[PDB]
Amino acid sequence: VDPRLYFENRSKFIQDQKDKGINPYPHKFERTISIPEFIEKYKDLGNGEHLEDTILNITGRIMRVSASGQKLRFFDLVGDGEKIQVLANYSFHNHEKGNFAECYDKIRRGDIVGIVGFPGKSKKGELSIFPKETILLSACLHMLPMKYGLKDTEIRYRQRYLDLLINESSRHTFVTRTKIINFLRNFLNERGFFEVETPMMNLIAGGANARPFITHHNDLDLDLYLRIATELPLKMLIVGGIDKVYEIGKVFRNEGIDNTHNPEFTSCEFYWAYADYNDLIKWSEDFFSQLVYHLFGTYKISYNKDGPENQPIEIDFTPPYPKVSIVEEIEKVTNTILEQPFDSNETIEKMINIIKEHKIELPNPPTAAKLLDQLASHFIENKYNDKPFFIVEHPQIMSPLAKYHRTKPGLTERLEMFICGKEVLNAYTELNDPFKQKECFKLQQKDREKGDTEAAQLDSAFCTSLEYGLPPTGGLGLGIDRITMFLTNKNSIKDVILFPTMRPAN
Amino acid sequence: DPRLYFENRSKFIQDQKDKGINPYPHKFERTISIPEFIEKYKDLGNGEHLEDTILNITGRIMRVSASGQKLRFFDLVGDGEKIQVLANYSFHNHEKGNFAECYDKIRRGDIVGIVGFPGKSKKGELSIFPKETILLSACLHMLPMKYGLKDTEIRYRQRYLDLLINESSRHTFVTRTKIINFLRNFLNERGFFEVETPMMNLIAGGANARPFITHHNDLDLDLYLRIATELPLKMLIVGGIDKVYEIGKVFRNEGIDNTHNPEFTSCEFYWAYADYNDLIKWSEDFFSQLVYHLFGTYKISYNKDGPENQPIEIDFTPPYPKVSIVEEIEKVTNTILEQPFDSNETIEKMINIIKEHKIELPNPPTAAKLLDQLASHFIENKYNDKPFFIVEHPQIMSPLAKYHRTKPGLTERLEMFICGKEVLNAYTELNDPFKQKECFKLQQKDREKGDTEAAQLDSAFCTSLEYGLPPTGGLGLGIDRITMFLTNKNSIKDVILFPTMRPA
Numbered sequence A: 001v002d003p004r005l006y007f008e009n010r011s012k013f014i015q016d017q018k019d020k021g022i023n024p025y026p027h028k029f030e031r032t033i034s035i036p037e038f039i040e041k042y043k044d045l046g047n048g049e050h051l052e053d054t055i056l057n058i059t060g061r062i063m064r065v066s067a068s069g070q071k072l073r074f075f076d077l078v079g080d081g082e083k084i085q086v087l088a089n090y091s092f093h094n095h096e097k098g099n100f101a102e103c104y105d106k107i108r109r110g111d112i113v114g115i116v117g118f119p120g121k122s123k124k125g126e127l128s129i130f131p132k133e134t135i136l137l138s139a140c141l142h143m144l145p146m147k148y149g150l151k152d153t154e155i156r157y158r159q160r161y162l163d164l165l166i167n168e169s170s171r172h173t174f175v176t177r178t179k180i181i182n183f184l185r186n187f188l189n190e191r192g193f194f195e196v197e198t199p200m201m202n203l204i205a206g207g208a209n210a211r212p213f214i215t216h217h218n219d220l221d222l223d224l225y226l227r228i229a230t231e232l233p234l235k236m237l238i239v240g241g242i243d244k245v246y247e248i249g250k251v252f253r254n255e256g257i258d259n260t261h262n263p264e265f266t267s268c269e270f271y272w273a274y275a276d277y278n279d280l281i282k283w284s285e286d287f288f289s290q291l292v293y294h295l296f297g298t299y300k301i302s303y304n305k306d307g308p309e310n311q312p313i314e315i316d317f318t319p320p321y322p323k324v325s326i327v328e329e330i331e332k333v334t335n336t337i338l339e340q341p342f343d344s345n346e347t348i349e350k351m352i353n354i355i356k357e358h359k360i361e362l363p364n365p366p367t368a369a370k371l372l373d374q375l376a377s378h379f380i381e382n383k384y385n386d387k388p389f390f391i392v393e394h395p396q397i398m399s400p401l402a403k404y405h406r407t408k409p410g411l412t413e414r415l416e417m418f419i420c421g422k423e424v425l426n427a428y429t430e431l432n433d434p435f436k437q438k439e440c441f442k443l444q445q446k447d448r449e450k451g452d453t454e455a456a457q458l459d460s461a462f463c464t465s466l467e468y469g470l471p472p473t474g475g476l477g478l479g480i481d482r483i484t485m486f487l488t489n490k491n492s493i494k495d496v497i498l499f500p501t502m503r504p505a506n
Numbered sequence B: 001d002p003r004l005y006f007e008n009r010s011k012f013i014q015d016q017k018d019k020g021i022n023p024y025p026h027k028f029e030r031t032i033s034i035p036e037f038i039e040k041y042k043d044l045g046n047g048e049h050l051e052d053t054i055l056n057i058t059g060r061i062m063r064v065s066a067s068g069q070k071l072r073f074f075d076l077v078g079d080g081e082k083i084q085v086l087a088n089y090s091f092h093n094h095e096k097g098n099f100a101e102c103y104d105k106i107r108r109g110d111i112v113g114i115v116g117f118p119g120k121s122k123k124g125e126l127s128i129f130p131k132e133t134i135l136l137s138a139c140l141h142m143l144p145m146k147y148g149l150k151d152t153e154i155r156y157r158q159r160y161l162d163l164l165i166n167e168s169s170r171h172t173f174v175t176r177t178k179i180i181n182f183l184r185n186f187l188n189e190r191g192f193f194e195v196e197t198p199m200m201n202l203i204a205g206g207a208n209a210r211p212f213i214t215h216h217n218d219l220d221l222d223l224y225l226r227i228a229t230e231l232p233l234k235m236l237i238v239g240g241i242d243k244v245y246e247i248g249k250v251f252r253n254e255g256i257d258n259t260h261n262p263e264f265t266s267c268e269f270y271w272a273y274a275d276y277n278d279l280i281k282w283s284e285d286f287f288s289q290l291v292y293h294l295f296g297t298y299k300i301s302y303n304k305d306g307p308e309n310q311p312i313e314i315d316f317t318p319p320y321p322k323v324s325i326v327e328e329i330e331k332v333t334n335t336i337l338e339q340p341f342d343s344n345e346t347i348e349k350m351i352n353i354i355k356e357h358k359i360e361l362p363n364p365p366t367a368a369k370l371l372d373q374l375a376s377h378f379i380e381n382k383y384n385d386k387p388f389f390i391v392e393h394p395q396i397m398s399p400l401a402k403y404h405r406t407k408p409g410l411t412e413r414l415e416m417f418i419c420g421k422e423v424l425n426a427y428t429e430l431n432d433p434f435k436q437k438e439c440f441k442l443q444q445k446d447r448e449k450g451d452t453e454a455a456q457l458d459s460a461f462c463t464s465l466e467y468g469l470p471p472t473g474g475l476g477l478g479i480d481r482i483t484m485f486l487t488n489k490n491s492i493k494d495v496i497l498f499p500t501m502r503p504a
C-alpha cells in the first residue's frame, strides 16, 4: 500500500547486507543454460519426473512469489521472454550454503536471482527448476506495477523497462520491429544495393518540406542543421558511381507531435539508377507483399483502426494496389477543374473556396501546395482502408525534386503509398536536370518568403553535384515506424518506439 | 579553362531543348550491367563479334578518342568496372541521326545509353559495339584526373568526384560497409537484439564528453544530442533484453582532428551475466575473425606514419597484451600515485610529473584528466605491432564502472588500442544504484571545477537501476577508427563519406 516505505525498507535491506558481510550485487555468476534452451531441453519430460543428477546454473528474474509452507516455496522465473516455475523444496536445499528460510524469505518480486539446481516437472506437470542454493544477483528495490497500472498510462513510455517486463505484447512488438528492419536490409542487399551513412548534421537541411533543428559546433563556431531527410547526399552518391545506394537511419523534424509524428523517426531511403516511377511502383508492391507474408504467412492482416475497444478492419496487402491520381480524383470528388498553373491566383482562390465550402481547415500560409495537400488529405487519403493504395502524379509545385511527367504537363512521376489514410512511402523519378532544379529551388525560396518555413532552401553543393550528371534514377523513402505500427497493430507511434519523445515530467 | 567549358555545355543543353530532343530522357531500359557484361563475355577471343546479341548498356563515358571520322572510342565505366565502346560508321543506325553529329557531342563524364552487340577488339579489349548511342545525363564540368585530387580538400566536399576517379576510395567504403555487416551478423549469431535509442535526450550521458544542443519549438524544450548509447541500453537490459546492442551515430561537441569527427558511428552492446573477462575474450575473438574475414590472414600492413614512410605489421592474432594503467604509469614515471587519486597531493604529483616531462597540462587539471594525459604520453603507444588492452582503470575515471572485485580504487574496465588510438571501451557495468549516485555526485564536484565533459546525473537511469540491473558486461566499438586501420587510412575523414567541414 506504501511504495515509498517499501523502497526505503529495501534500501535498508541492501545496506544491512553490506554491514553484515554479504555483497548484494556480486560481480559474476557463470550461467550454464538459458531459460528458453532449458524449456526446450526438458519440456518433453514426464509428470513428476526428476533429474537430480544433472545440476545446472540458470539465471532469471522473479515475477511471482508464493509458498505452500515454510519448506516449499514457489516462484516464477522469467528470462528472454519465456518463463519457468521455481520449486524450492527444503529436502533439496544445500544446507552447507545457508539456512533455507533465511535465504528464501528475503526474495521479493522482481529480484534477479542465480539458481544452482536440477530440472524436473511438478506433480501437476509444471516444468520447474529445483534449486539447491539461490543467491541474489540484483535486488528490485521498488514494487513492480500491475498490468492495469500500465494500461492507459504513460509509464510504458517514460519507464519502458516496466512495460518490457510486465507486458509480453511489448517484447513481441519490438522483436517484430527489428524483424521488419532485418527484412528490409536483406531485401536490399539481395538486390545488390549498398548500405551507406550520410551525415545527420548539415549546413542546410534539404530533401523534404519540414522545419529542421539547429545545433552549434563550438570549436568550428558553425551552425549545423539536423537532417530532415537523406535524399540529397544519396543522390550525390548516385553521381559518385554507386548506382544502388540506400540508408536506414534517424531523421529529425521540428514540428507537431501526435500519434503519427515523433520528432525523431527512422526512415529508409534507397536510390536505384536507371529506374523510374513504374519500377518504384512494382518495388513497393513486391516489398510490402513479401514483408507481410514473411511476418504472418498471409497477405491479409487485421488492424484495430478505431482503437483497441472498437472492432478491427482487415488490410489486404495483396498486389496490385489501387493507383489514384491526386488532381484527377480531387476533380471528380469535388466536381471541379483545377486549371493550371495550380499556383495561380485563380486556382488558389478556387481551392480556397472548396476548402471553405466543406468547412475544411484552412492551411497557413495558404500556399498552393498546402491547399492541394489539405484537399488530398480530406478527400483522397482515406479513400481506401481495405488495402494500401497509391496517390500518384503530384503537381510540380508539390514536388520540387521530382522529375516532370513525360506525358502530363505540370505533373510529376511521383507516388505515395498509404495505409489507413497514413502516408508511409514517398517515391518518384528523380529530377536530374540542374537547369530545371534551380527553378524549383528559387520558386521554393519565394514560397519560403511567403511564410512557408517548410519550403526547401537552396543547396548549392547538391546543385553542383547535379551539374556533373545525375543519371536517370528512381528514389523511394519508407516510414519504418509507421510500417511497424500497422504490422504490429498499434494505434500510436509511441508504441513502436522504445523511448518516444514525451513532455518532460520536470 | 573550366568556366568556358561549363558555359559551352550549358548552352549546349539549352540548344538541345530548343531543337526538340530531350537532353535528359526519362527512361532507358538496361538489359545487362557492366559487371554482368564483363562476366558474360570475358572469355571471347580477340576479334569475335556476336552481332546478333543486341544489348542495352549503360555507364559514364570517361575517355574520348577517335581514329578519323568513322571510328570513335570511349571508356564506359560503371559499378567500379570499365569496358571499351567502339563506335564504327558501318554498324551505326543512320535513321536516328548523323554519326559524326551524334558522337562529337559526347565528352568525358557523360552518362550514355548504348544499344549494340558484344565483341572483342583487334587488340583484344572487351568492347561493346553500338548501333545507337543516347545521351542520358550530361557532365557539364571538367572531370579532373587522379592528380587533381591529391593536394586538395575536394575528396571530402565532392565525394562523388573522388568515388568516380580514385578507384581506392570505393574500395575503402565497401570495406567500411563490410565491416559493419560482419559486426551485425557477428552479434546476431550470438543472440543479440538490435534496437534504436533516442538521439535527443534531456541529459547527455554515457561518456565524458561535451554534447551538442538543439531546441524543439512546439515543446519549447532544449535537448542534447546523445554522446553515447550506454544508459538507454542498460535500461533495456533491466527491461529483460539481456543481449541488446545498437550500431548508430553519436554526437560529441569537441575539437576536430585526424581521428575525431563531431558525429561518428559506434556500436554499443550489453550482454547480461557477462563480465570483464568475457568482454576481453569477445574483443579478441571479434577482431581476429573480422581481420581474417577481410584479409584471409591475421596480419595487416598499416602506414602508421603516413605513406611517405615504411609501414608496420599489425598482428591481430589473439591473445593481446593487457596492461594496468596505474601500475604502468608508476613504473614508467618511477613515481607512486596514491589513493584517493583525486587527493590534492597526488593531483599535484601528477601535475609535477607532466611539468618535468614538458607535457601540456589538461584544460582543468583534474585527477581524471591528469591520469588520462599520463596514460596517453606513457602507455598508449607501448604496442604498435599488435593491438593491446589498457585495463583496471580507477573509479575516478570510470563513474559507470563496477568497482574492481579485488583491487580497491580501480574498476574492471578495458580499453583496446591500435597504434595508440582508442578503438574499444568495455567494462563490467555498475548495477548497485547507491554506488552509482555516489559516482555521479563526484562527477558533479568535478564539474564545479570547470569540466564541461563531466557526466550529469540521469534520474531516469538511476531509477532504472533501482528495479534491478543484473550483472552485465558492456562494450563499445569505434567503427570509424576500426575502418581506418582496416583500410590503411591515417585520417578519419578518409573513411567518412561526408566529414564535417566549413562551408565553401
Ligand SMILES: O=c1oc(CC2CCCCC2)cc2cc(O)cc(O)c12
Pocket: A253, A254, A255, A256, A260, A261, A262, A263, A264, A265, A267, A423, A424, A425, A426, A477, A478, A479, A481, A482, A493
Ligand atoms: O513517421 C513519419 O513519417 C513521415 C512521412 C514519411 C513518408 C514516407 C517517406 C518518409 C517520410 C513524416 C513524419 C514527420 C514527423 O515529424 C514525424 C514522423 O514520425 C514522420
Ligand SMILES: O=c1oc(CC2CCCCC2)cc2cc(O)cc(O)c12
Pocket: B252, B253, B254, B255, B259, B260, B261, B262, B263, B264, B266, B422, B423, B424, B425, B476, B477, B478, B480, B481, B492
Ligand atoms: O571516433 C571516435 O572515437 C572515440 C572513442 C571511441 C572508443 C570506443 C568506444 C566508442 C568511442 C571518441 C570520439 C570522440 C569524438 O569527438 C569524435 C570521434 O570520432 C571519436
Ligand SMILES: N[C@@H](CCCC[NH3+])C(=O)O
Pocket: A207, A208, A209, A228, A229, A230, A231, A269, A426, A427, A428, A430, A474, A475, A476, A477, A478
Ligand atoms: N526524402 C523523401 C522520401 C524519399 C524520396 C526519394 N526520391 C521524403 O522526405 O519524403
Ligand SMILES: N[C@@H](CCCC[NH3+])C(=O)O
Pocket: B206, B207, B227, B228, B229, B230, B268, B425, B426, B427, B474, B475, B476, B477
Ligand atoms: N559509452 C562508452 C562505450 C561503452 C562502454 C561499455 N558500457 C564510450 O563512449 O566509450
